[PDB]
RNA sequence: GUAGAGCACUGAUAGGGCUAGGGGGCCCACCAGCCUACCAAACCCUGUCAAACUCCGAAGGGUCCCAGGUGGAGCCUGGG
RNA sequence: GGUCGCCUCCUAAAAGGUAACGGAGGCGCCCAAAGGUCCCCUCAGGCGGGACGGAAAUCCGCCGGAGAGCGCAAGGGUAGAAGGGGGCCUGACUGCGAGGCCUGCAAGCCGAGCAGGGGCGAAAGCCGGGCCUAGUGAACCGGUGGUCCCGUGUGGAAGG
RNA sequence: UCCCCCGUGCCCAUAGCGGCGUGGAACCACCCGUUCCCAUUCCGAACACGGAAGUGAAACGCGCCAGCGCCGAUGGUACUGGGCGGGCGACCGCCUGGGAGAGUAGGUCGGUGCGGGGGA
RNA sequence: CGCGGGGUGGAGCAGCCUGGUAGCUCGUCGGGCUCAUAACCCGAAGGUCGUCGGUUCAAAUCCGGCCCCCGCAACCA
RNA sequence: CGCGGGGUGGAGCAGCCUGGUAGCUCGUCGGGCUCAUAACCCGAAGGUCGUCGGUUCAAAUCCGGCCCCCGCAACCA
């Protein structure tokens, strides 16, 4: 048996893992918010901005905004551009949402 | 496809000339099958409506 | 959101007499009320009564929430019913509309039922929590003879963290519920 | 001297041949477009560079050998692995 | 008579009878037993005549175990018809026995009272038969 | 997905266990208690059957790659 | 007497294919929602639980991987949806088609990708009708709407 | 490089069902609230958001057992590509190569790659 | 498909070429009578007059035709 | 067995086509009139629809196996 959460993961995840593009796997915690970049074809992570590593604070969605700006620069150094946003079981609204448009601030294409 | 299910062609209400080919049940929707579609003689989408085939 | 007379009743009076019996080794293992799902469960609104609304707005002005129309699981012959036909009135009183409702049942509405005589105590399921059925509706404080039109009993379901049937007994019994024996 | 009240069979009907099944095999060169498997419902699953048609047909998207993979409970897959 | 009390399909194919049985080649309920030496189909007609035979042997007493069931439709074309025009209508019901399969067992019966018993029931059968008693080889099986 | 083989599903199936309602006294129920050398659902253990059953599954057979193979071999285009 | 085209299954001997007046069934339709998308969700059933209320109306509980559902026959497939609900919608597009599946012919069938112009989506992407496999009819003769290509010396017209 | 943790891939249930335990400083979760964005055929259950008082009860995590499910040999056999003989037949035997299904002995309460965040 | 006509009370139809009344027997209730099933007889419920949109001063008789039954006709690769 | 039609209150018939929809006659039981019986007048009672599967939400109705009534055949050259 699987959870609404568990199904909804695969449902949108698989929609994307079969696009060939670098998948940017997010994670929404009630504490703070992070996201890595995975080339699932192998399985390796390309780069991994966060909020525990960057140890920031001051409103969840504004520190959701920031972490992406980290991702943008810190990934674009490794010539990364092909971006496919794994939005997880979470939607595209507020928290995870801001991370995206923040990841867009840098030059990341998605 | 039957008595009940009539055939119909889609008129372009910009020039009144025919355009497409499909069916529609004339029971549950006795109205006019009005749908946006494309035109080669216009190269733009427009309005379309059932003219009796 | 708020703070009321039964919500604090469950607070400083009920939590202790519960750690009395079962002596819970943790703050949370202790019982507490979660869901309260009222069910007029009509079917009296078959392929006819569009006036199922003037019976379900009464359900609103006695539960505070609009009730959601539960339809047909499938189509049924002898019941005179098609898959899709409205046959249910489910309102799930959750959080602080629950205490606002539950007290008004116990202190005002429960007694005004005709020939009250406890509460059927075997009706506890076992694997968890509890629920039991009505007879009418105007016994509820919000209405009387002219406001209520047709008569309509209703089902009412408690959903508590009562893992066990015994500890459920205590939770509700202490909370204000009169039982048969 | 012969026949009498001879029972007629209600059946004797039949379908066409569908000539389904697997058309290309592992370690077989293919080009882009080729059909790898005809089927009715993914007995075989669309791998990398393998697409799926409106009847569950499975066709190659790029060149180089086909390759079969069996992921147990997940499904049987076939992908094409590009040239060299 | 031993007919299937419900049926998935009407007529059913012939199928050859190559080789030994698939199970029940070792006694499992009764003390003694009757077995196939040669493969056949057995009619419900036959089976019932063997049962009735034994049943009449130890008149009043004994318990009979019978380990085969007529589950196959023995179809047959009516009298004087030519080939084709469909398959025969189902005329009987038969059960597929191969060599080794156990057919008749008995318990609550003397030694020879089950010898003579399972002897005659052998005679109401289209096939050569052996009678064998329950043994450790059966217990180990 | 075949021979085999196995009931895990689809159906058959013999017995026994256990158990609905039916059957039937005890009661004579206005109803409960029902007891069962009765019928027997699901359900269990033993024991089985199946082209249109499949938890399984050969020998093989297909098909590609690579190697032997010069054969009244193979291939392309045409006449009969 | 029965049959005649189509689809499913079996016969069919584990590739494809294979007959019989072999064994069993269906098709000659349907859907402006049953479609496209995006978001979301999860069965049958069984046990306990409860006014009317039931073996089965609806509400509550614990057990359920799939035995439900997927318009309708069957097989395969299938909840990590193909199934249930909602919002916007009309790609049930026009111009094509690398490459193949099948195949005596002719038909049948899959389709990446390119161009125009739109749909939904934040976007990655998805849409050239429906979970697929039936729902069908070659060519001739003519009808209707267009285009404005021929038009019997010639401009038109007639006809094509 | 060793360990715990989080986010994840992969073998395909030896992974799982269940019962027994332990983990909160960290990280994860429940938990606090409806003001804001967002949100329910009713309900902040869920999705959302602002939080950090409580906690490890639930879930999840690491683990323990083998009751279930699961995987599961060796040996022998059925069957069979090929080559022979045998019976009126239904069918049976030998050679050579291949060789199961059940069942038996036993195994199993997972195994790991990438990055990150702690421990030394 | 194209020419012909209407689709009237619950079941039939005269209103109708020339608009004016929200129409008559059968059927149905109650009633005098009958010995009765009956004819007779006095009162009755029934039109959104197929609909939609009109023509006016309103329409059910005059129209655009929606509609889809009866009628005739001709064609069918 | 081959085709065709049939099976519904006690008797005989509708009802199936287009499913949810059980009517006509007789008779039968209760009551009236009558000295009484019929007649006639007033009321009511009475079929899970051959039989079984099954389709559907659901079957007199649709479908298929079997039992039965009836109708033509089973050509024997
Ligand atoms: C009775 N006749 C005879 C016609 C022929 N020329 C002669 C004759 O006897 N023909 C017959 C020949 C045999 C034929 N028959 C019978 C049985 C059968 N199974 N197959 C046949 O062909 O049926 C025919 C028949 O009687 O008409 C005429 N009225 N003409
Ligand atoms: Mg205690
Ligand atoms: Mg009382
Ligand atoms: Mg002769
Ligand atoms: Mg076939
Ligand atoms: Mg039995
Ligand atoms: Mg039994
Ligand atoms: Mg018995
Ligand atoms: Mg008992
Ligand atoms: Mg088989
Ligand atoms: Mg195995
Ligand atoms: Mg093997
Ligand atoms: Mg040569
Ligand atoms: Mg040439
Ligand atoms: Mg040449
Ligand atoms: Mg040439
Ligand atoms: Mg003929
Ligand atoms: Mg081929
Ligand atoms: Mg042929
Ligand atoms: Mg049960
Ligand atoms: Mg119950
Ligand atoms: Mg109840
Ligand atoms: Mg009850
Ligand atoms: Mg119930
Ligand atoms: Mg279906
Ligand atoms: Mg099959
Ligand atoms: Mg199946
Ligand atoms: Mg959906
Ligand atoms: Mg919907
Ligand atoms: Mg939007
Ligand atoms: Mg092509
Ligand atoms: Mg081509
Ligand atoms: Mg494309
Ligand atoms: Mg686009
Ligand atoms: Mg289809
Ligand atoms: Mg013209
Ligand atoms: Mg010109
Ligand atoms: Mg001029
Ligand atoms: Mg022209
Ligand atoms: Mg993870
Ligand atoms: Mg604990
Ligand atoms: Mg603390
Ligand atoms: Mg605990
Ligand atoms: Mg767990
Ligand atoms: Mg660890
Ligand atoms: Mg570890
Ligand atoms: Mg360790
Ligand atoms: Mg370990
Ligand atoms: Mg141990
Ligand atoms: Mg062990
Ligand atoms: Mg052990
Ligand atoms: Mg094993
Ligand atoms: Mg040979
Ligand atoms: Mg031989
Ligand atoms: Mg071996
Ligand atoms: Mg051998
Ligand atoms: Mg470290
Ligand atoms: Mg340090
Ligand atoms: Mg006329
Ligand atoms: Mg006038
Ligand atoms: Mg008188
Ligand atoms: Mg004529
Ligand atoms: Mg015509
Ligand atoms: Mg008939
Ligand atoms: Mg009769
Ligand atoms: Mg009549
Ligand atoms: Mg019939
Ligand atoms: Mg009826
Ligand atoms: Mg009278
Ligand atoms: Mg019938
Ligand atoms: Mg005759
Ligand atoms: Zn145009």
mmCIF file with all atom_site columns, N, CA and C (backbone and C1' of nucleotides) in Angstrom, chain I residues 59-76:
data_model
loop_
_atom_site.group_PDB
_atom_site.id
_atom_site.type_symbol
_atom_site.label_atom_id
_atom_site.label_alt_id
_atom_site.label_comp_id
_atom_site.label_asym_id
_atom_site.label_entity_id
_atom_site.label_seq_id
_atom_site.pdbx_PDB_ins_code
_atom_site.Cartn_x
_atom_site.Cartn_y
_atom_site.Cartn_z
_atom_site.occupancy
_atom_site.B_iso_or_equiv
_atom_site.pdbx_formal_charge
_atom_site.auth_seq_id
_atom_site.auth_comp_id
_atom_site.auth_asym_id
_atom_site.auth_atom_id
_atom_site.pdbx_PDB_model_num
ATOM 1   P P     . A I 1 59 ? -50.677 38.339 -29.785 1.00 0.00 ? 59 A I P     1
ATOM 2   O "O5'" . A I 1 59 ? -51.504 37.717 -31.001 1.00 0.00 ? 59 A I "O5'" 1
ATOM 3   C "C5'" . A I 1 59 ? -51.812 36.328 -31.058 1.00 0.00 ? 59 A I "C5'" 1
ATOM 4   C "C4'" . A I 1 59 ? -53.289 36.075 -30.856 1.00 0.00 ? 59 A I "C4'" 1
ATOM 5   C "C3'" . A I 1 59 ? -53.771 34.647 -31.068 1.00 0.00 ? 59 A I "C3'" 1
ATOM 6   O "O3'" . A I 1 59 ? -53.513 33.795 -29.967 1.00 0.00 ? 59 A I "O3'" 1
ATOM 7   C "C1'" . A I 1 59 ? -55.226 36.130 -32.175 1.00 0.00 ? 59 A I "C1'" 1
ATOM 8   P P     . A I 1 60 ? -52.724 32.409 -30.177 1.00 0.00 ? 60 A I P     1
ATOM 9   O "O5'" . A I 1 60 ? -53.743 31.499 -31.004 1.00 0.00 ? 60 A I "O5'" 1
ATOM 10  C "C5'" . A I 1 60 ? -53.445 30.134 -31.269 1.00 0.00 ? 60 A I "C5'" 1
ATOM 11  C "C4'" . A I 1 60 ? -54.463 29.485 -32.178 1.00 0.00 ? 60 A I "C4'" 1
ATOM 12  C "C3'" . A I 1 60 ? -54.741 30.197 -33.494 1.00 0.00 ? 60 A I "C3'" 1
ATOM 13  O "O3'" . A I 1 60 ? -53.751 29.951 -34.481 1.00 0.00 ? 60 A I "O3'" 1
ATOM 14  C "C1'" . A I 1 60 ? -56.787 29.565 -32.487 1.00 0.00 ? 60 A I "C1'" 1
ATOM 15  P P     . U I 1 61 ? -53.468 31.031 -35.642 1.00 0.00 ? 61 U I P     1
ATOM 16  O "O5'" . U I 1 61 ? -54.405 30.554 -36.838 1.00 0.00 ? 61 U I "O5'" 1
ATOM 17  C "C5'" . U I 1 61 ? -54.562 31.346 -38.010 1.00 0.00 ? 61 U I "C5'" 1
ATOM 18  C "C4'" . U I 1 61 ? -55.413 30.640 -39.034 1.00 0.00 ? 61 U I "C4'" 1
ATOM 19  C "C3'" . U I 1 61 ? -56.047 31.536 -40.097 1.00 0.00 ? 61 U I "C3'" 1
ATOM 20  O "O3'" . U I 1 61 ? -56.156 30.820 -41.328 1.00 0.00 ? 61 U I "O3'" 1
ATOM 21  C "C1'" . U I 1 61 ? -57.743 30.445 -38.862 1.00 0.00 ? 61 U I "C1'" 1
ATOM 22  P P     . C I 1 62 ? -55.023 30.964 -42.463 1.00 0.00 ? 62 C I P     1
ATOM 23  O "O5'" . C I 1 62 ? -54.604 32.501 -42.413 1.00 0.00 ? 62 C I "O5'" 1
ATOM 24  C "C5'" . C I 1 62 ? -54.708 33.319 -43.569 1.00 0.00 ? 62 C I "C5'" 1
ATOM 25  C "C4'" . C I 1 62 ? -53.678 34.422 -43.567 1.00 0.00 ? 62 C I "C4'" 1
ATOM 26  C "C3'" . C I 1 62 ? -52.227 33.989 -43.407 1.00 0.00 ? 62 C I "C3'" 1
ATOM 27  O "O3'" . C I 1 62 ? -51.653 33.545 -44.629 1.00 0.00 ? 62 C I "O3'" 1
ATOM 28  C "C1'" . C I 1 62 ? -52.685 35.858 -42.003 1.00 0.00 ? 62 C I "C1'" 1
ATOM 29  P P     . C I 1 63 ? -50.306 32.665 -44.636 1.00 0.00 ? 63 C I P     1
ATOM 30  O "O5'" . C I 1 63 ? -49.200 33.640 -45.241 1.00 0.00 ? 63 C I "O5'" 1
ATOM 31  C "C5'" . C I 1 63 ? -47.829 33.269 -45.238 1.00 0.00 ? 63 C I "C5'" 1
ATOM 32  C "C4'" . C I 1 63 ? -46.996 34.215 -44.410 1.00 0.00 ? 63 C I "C4'" 1
ATOM 33  C "C3'" . C I 1 63 ? -45.586 33.746 -44.080 1.00 0.00 ? 63 C I "C3'" 1
ATOM 34  O "O3'" . C I 1 63 ? -44.657 33.909 -45.137 1.00 0.00 ? 63 C I "O3'" 1
ATOM 35  C "C1'" . C I 1 63 ? -46.611 34.506 -42.113 1.00 0.00 ? 63 C I "C1'" 1
ATOM 36  P P     . G I 1 64 ? -43.890 32.626 -45.739 1.00 0.00 ? 64 G I P     1
ATOM 37  O "O5'" . G I 1 64 ? -42.567 32.514 -44.856 1.00 0.00 ? 64 G I "O5'" 1
ATOM 38  C "C5'" . G I 1 64 ? -41.462 33.370 -45.105 1.00 0.00 ? 64 G I "C5'" 1
ATOM 39  C "C4'" . G I 1 64 ? -40.345 33.160 -44.113 1.00 0.00 ? 64 G I "C4'" 1
ATOM 40  C "C3'" . G I 1 64 ? -40.138 31.740 -43.612 1.00 0.00 ? 64 G I "C3'" 1
ATOM 41  O "O3'" . G I 1 64 ? -39.471 30.899 -44.538 1.00 0.00 ? 64 G I "O3'" 1
ATOM 42  C "C1'" . G I 1 64 ? -40.065 33.221 -41.783 1.00 0.00 ? 64 G I "C1'" 1
ATOM 43  P P     . G I 1 65 ? -40.159 29.520 -45.008 1.00 0.00 ? 65 G I P     1
ATOM 44  O "O5'" . G I 1 65 ? -39.409 28.388 -44.164 1.00 0.00 ? 65 G I "O5'" 1
ATOM 45  C "C5'" . G I 1 65 ? -38.174 28.642 -43.505 1.00 0.00 ? 65 G I "C5'" 1
ATOM 46  C "C4'" . G I 1 65 ? -38.290 28.395 -42.024 1.00 0.00 ? 65 G I "C4'" 1
ATOM 47  C "C3'" . G I 1 65 ? -38.464 26.944 -41.600 1.00 0.00 ? 65 G I "C3'" 1
ATOM 48  O "O3'" . G I 1 65 ? -37.241 26.231 -41.511 1.00 0.00 ? 65 G I "O3'" 1
ATOM 49  C "C1'" . G I 1 65 ? -40.116 28.259 -40.553 1.00 0.00 ? 65 G I "C1'" 1
ATOM 50  P P     . C I 1 66 ? -37.245 24.622 -41.502 1.00 0.00 ? 66 C I P     1
ATOM 51  O "O5'" . C I 1 66 ? -37.076 24.233 -39.969 1.00 0.00 ? 66 C I "O5'" 1
ATOM 52  C "C5'" . C I 1 66 ? -36.078 24.847 -39.168 1.00 0.00 ? 66 C I "C5'" 1
ATOM 53  C "C4'" . C I 1 66 ? -36.550 25.027 -37.746 1.00 0.00 ? 66 C I "C4'" 1
ATOM 54  C "C3'" . C I 1 66 ? -36.978 23.761 -37.019 1.00 0.00 ? 66 C I "C3'" 1
ATOM 55  O "O3'" . C I 1 66 ? -35.878 23.023 -36.503 1.00 0.00 ? 66 C I "O3'" 1
ATOM 56  C "C1'" . C I 1 66 ? -38.587 25.470 -36.667 1.00 0.00 ? 66 C I "C1'" 1
ATOM 57  P P     . C I 1 67 ? -36.008 21.449 -36.173 1.00 0.00 ? 67 C I P     1
ATOM 58  O "O5'" . C I 1 67 ? -37.250 21.362 -35.169 1.00 0.00 ? 67 C I "O5'" 1
ATOM 59  C "C5'" . C I 1 67 ? -37.726 20.116 -34.681 1.00 0.00 ? 67 C I "C5'" 1
ATOM 60  C "C4'" . C I 1 67 ? -39.226 19.992 -34.824 1.00 0.00 ? 67 C I "C4'" 1
ATOM 61  C "C3'" . C I 1 67 ? -39.736 18.684 -35.417 1.00 0.00 ? 67 C I "C3'" 1
ATOM 62  O "O3'" . C I 1 67 ? -39.820 17.624 -34.467 1.00 0.00 ? 67 C I "O3'" 1
ATOM 63  C "C1'" . C I 1 67 ? -40.819 20.516 -36.478 1.00 0.00 ? 67 C I "C1'" 1
ATOM 64  P P     . C I 1 68 ? -38.572 16.633 -34.196 1.00 0.00 ? 68 C I P     1
ATOM 65  O "O5'" . C I 1 68 ? -39.038 15.209 -34.759 1.00 0.00 ? 68 C I "O5'" 1
ATOM 66  C "C5'" . C I 1 68 ? -40.298 14.644 -34.418 1.00 0.00 ? 68 C I "C5'" 1
ATOM 67  C "C4'" . C I 1 68 ? -41.245 14.722 -35.584 1.00 0.00 ? 68 C I "C4'" 1
ATOM 68  C "C3'" . C I 1 68 ? -41.021 13.706 -36.695 1.00 0.00 ? 68 C I "C3'" 1
ATOM 69  O "O3'" . C I 1 68 ? -41.689 12.480 -36.435 1.00 0.00 ? 68 C I "O3'" 1
ATOM 70  C "C1'" . C I 1 68 ? -41.133 15.876 -37.628 1.00 0.00 ? 68 C I "C1'" 1
ATOM 71  P P     . C I 1 69 ? -41.494 11.198 -37.391 1.00 0.00 ? 69 C I P     1
ATOM 72  O "O5'" . C I 1 69 ? -42.960 10.887 -37.937 1.00 0.00 ? 69 C I "O5'" 1
ATOM 73  C "C5'" . C I 1 69 ? -43.900 10.164 -37.155 1.00 0.00 ? 69 C I "C5'" 1
ATOM 74  C "C4'" . C I 1 69 ? -45.317 10.419 -37.607 1.00 0.00 ? 69 C I "C4'" 1
ATOM 75  C "C3'" . C I 1 69 ? -45.624 10.137 -39.070 1.00 0.00 ? 69 C I "C3'" 1
ATOM 76  O "O3'" . C I 1 69 ? -45.808 8.762  -39.367 1.00 0.00 ? 69 C I "O3'" 1
ATOM 77  C "C1'" . C I 1 69 ? -46.545 12.229 -38.466 1.00 0.00 ? 69 C I "C1'" 1
ATOM 78  P P     . C I 1 70 ? -45.609 8.231  -40.869 1.00 0.00 ? 70 C I P     1
ATOM 79  O "O5'" . C I 1 70 ? -46.906 8.753  -41.638 1.00 0.00 ? 70 C I "O5'" 1
ATOM 80  C "C5'" . C I 1 70 ? -48.203 8.382  -41.195 1.00 0.00 ? 70 C I "C5'" 1
ATOM 81  C "C4'" . C I 1 70 ? -49.296 9.117  -41.933 1.00 0.00 ? 70 C I "C4'" 1
ATOM 82  C "C3'" . C I 1 70 ? -49.126 9.249  -43.431 1.00 0.00 ? 70 C I "C3'" 1
ATOM 83  O "O3'" . C I 1 70 ? -49.375 8.045  -44.127 1.00 0.00 ? 70 C I "O3'" 1
ATOM 84  C "C1'" . C I 1 70 ? -49.921 11.290 -42.543 1.00 0.00 ? 70 C I "C1'" 1
ATOM 85  P P     . G I 1 71 ? -48.384 7.603  -45.303 1.00 0.00 ? 71 G I P     1
ATOM 86  O "O5'" . G I 1 71 ? -48.914 8.441  -46.553 1.00 0.00 ? 71 G I "O5'" 1
ATOM 87  C "C5'" . G I 1 71 ? -50.309 8.619  -46.765 1.00 0.00 ? 71 G I "C5'" 1
ATOM 88  C "C4'" . G I 1 71 ? -50.604 9.770  -47.693 1.00 0.00 ? 71 G I "C4'" 1
ATOM 89  C "C3'" . G I 1 71 ? -49.710 9.892  -48.907 1.00 0.00 ? 71 G I "C3'" 1
ATOM 90  O "O3'" . G I 1 71 ? -49.975 8.937  -49.907 1.00 0.00 ? 71 G I "O3'" 1
ATOM 91  C "C1'" . G I 1 71 ? -49.946 12.005 -47.950 1.00 0.00 ? 71 G I "C1'" 1
ATOM 92  P P     . C I 1 72 ? -48.789 7.973  -50.396 1.00 0.00 ? 72 C I P     1
ATOM 93  O "O5'" . C I 1 72 ? -48.729 8.251  -51.968 1.00 0.00 ? 72 C I "O5'" 1
ATOM 94  C "C5'" . C I 1 72 ? -49.779 8.959  -52.618 1.00 0.00 ? 72 C I "C5'" 1
ATOM 95  C "C4'" . C I 1 72 ? -49.250 10.052 -53.518 1.00 0.00 ? 72 C I "C4'" 1
ATOM 96  C "C3'" . C I 1 72 ? -47.971 9.728  -54.270 1.00 0.00 ? 72 C I "C3'" 1
ATOM 97  O "O3'" . C I 1 72 ? -48.190 8.935  -55.419 1.00 0.00 ? 72 C I "O3'" 1
ATOM 98  C "C1'" . C I 1 72 ? -47.807 11.893 -53.322 1.00 0.00 ? 72 C I "C1'" 1
ATOM 99  P P     . A I 1 73 ? -47.072 7.872  -55.858 1.00 0.00 ? 73 A I P     1
ATOM 100 O "O5'" . A I 1 73 ? -45.911 8.783  -56.465 1.00 0.00 ? 73 A I "O5'" 1
ATOM 101 C "C5'" . A I 1 73 ? -46.189 9.683  -57.530 1.00 0.00 ? 73 A I "C5'" 1
ATOM 102 C "C4'" . A I 1 73 ? -45.098 10.707 -57.721 1.00 0.00 ? 73 A I "C4'" 1
ATOM 103 C "C3'" . A I 1 73 ? -43.684 10.169 -57.865 1.00 0.00 ? 73 A I "C3'" 1
ATOM 104 O "O3'" . A I 1 73 ? -43.424 9.701  -59.183 1.00 0.00 ? 73 A I "O3'" 1
ATOM 105 C "C1'" . A I 1 73 ? -43.696 12.041 -56.401 1.00 0.00 ? 73 A I "C1'" 1
ATOM 106 P P     . A I 1 74 ? -43.022 8.166  -59.468 1.00 0.00 ? 74 A I P     1
ATOM 107 O "O5'" . A I 1 74 ? -41.534 8.286  -60.031 1.00 0.00 ? 74 A I "O5'" 1
ATOM 108 C "C5'" . A I 1 74 ? -41.156 9.389  -60.839 1.00 0.00 ? 74 A I "C5'" 1
ATOM 109 C "C4'" . A I 1 74 ? -39.904 10.050 -60.322 1.00 0.00 ? 74 A I "C4'" 1
ATOM 110 C "C3'" . A I 1 74 ? -38.723 9.135  -60.045 1.00 0.00 ? 74 A I "C3'" 1
ATOM 111 O "O3'" . A I 1 74 ? -38.041 8.673  -61.199 1.00 0.00 ? 74 A I "O3'" 1
ATOM 112 C "C1'" . A I 1 74 ? -38.956 10.640 -58.253 1.00 0.00 ? 74 A I "C1'" 1
ATOM 113 P P     . C I 1 75 ? -37.308 7.238  -61.144 1.00 0.00 ? 75 C I P     1
ATOM 114 O "O5'" . C I 1 75 ? -35.912 7.531  -60.418 1.00 0.00 ? 75 C I "O5'" 1
ATOM 115 C "C5'" . C I 1 75 ? -34.906 8.328  -61.027 1.00 0.00 ? 75 C I "C5'" 1
ATOM 116 C "C4'" . C I 1 75 ? -33.815 8.647  -60.044 1.00 0.00 ? 75 C I "C4'" 1
ATOM 117 C "C3'" . C I 1 75 ? -33.069 7.447  -59.483 1.00 0.00 ? 75 C I "C3'" 1
ATOM 118 O "O3'" . C I 1 75 ? -32.053 6.952  -60.335 1.00 0.00 ? 75 C I "O3'" 1
ATOM 119 C "C1'" . C I 1 75 ? -33.742 8.827  -57.705 1.00 0.00 ? 75 C I "C1'" 1
ATOM 120 P P     . C I 1 76 ? -31.862 5.363  -60.499 1.00 0.00 ? 76 C I P     1
ATOM 121 O "O5'" . C I 1 76 ? -30.973 4.915  -59.257 1.00 0.00 ? 76 C I "O5'" 1
ATOM 122 C "C5'" . C I 1 76 ? -29.748 5.573  -58.973 1.00 0.00 ? 76 C I "C5'" 1
ATOM 123 C "C4'" . C I 1 76 ? -29.357 5.414  -57.525 1.00 0.00 ? 76 C I "C4'" 1
ATOM 124 C "C3'" . C I 1 76 ? -29.203 3.978  -57.044 1.00 0.00 ? 76 C I "C3'" 1
ATOM 125 O "O3'" . C I 1 76 ? -27.924 3.434  -57.353 1.00 0.00 ? 76 C I "O3'" 1
ATOM 126 C "C1'" . C I 1 76 ? -30.559 5.182  -55.520 1.00 0.00 ? 76 C I "C1'" 1
#
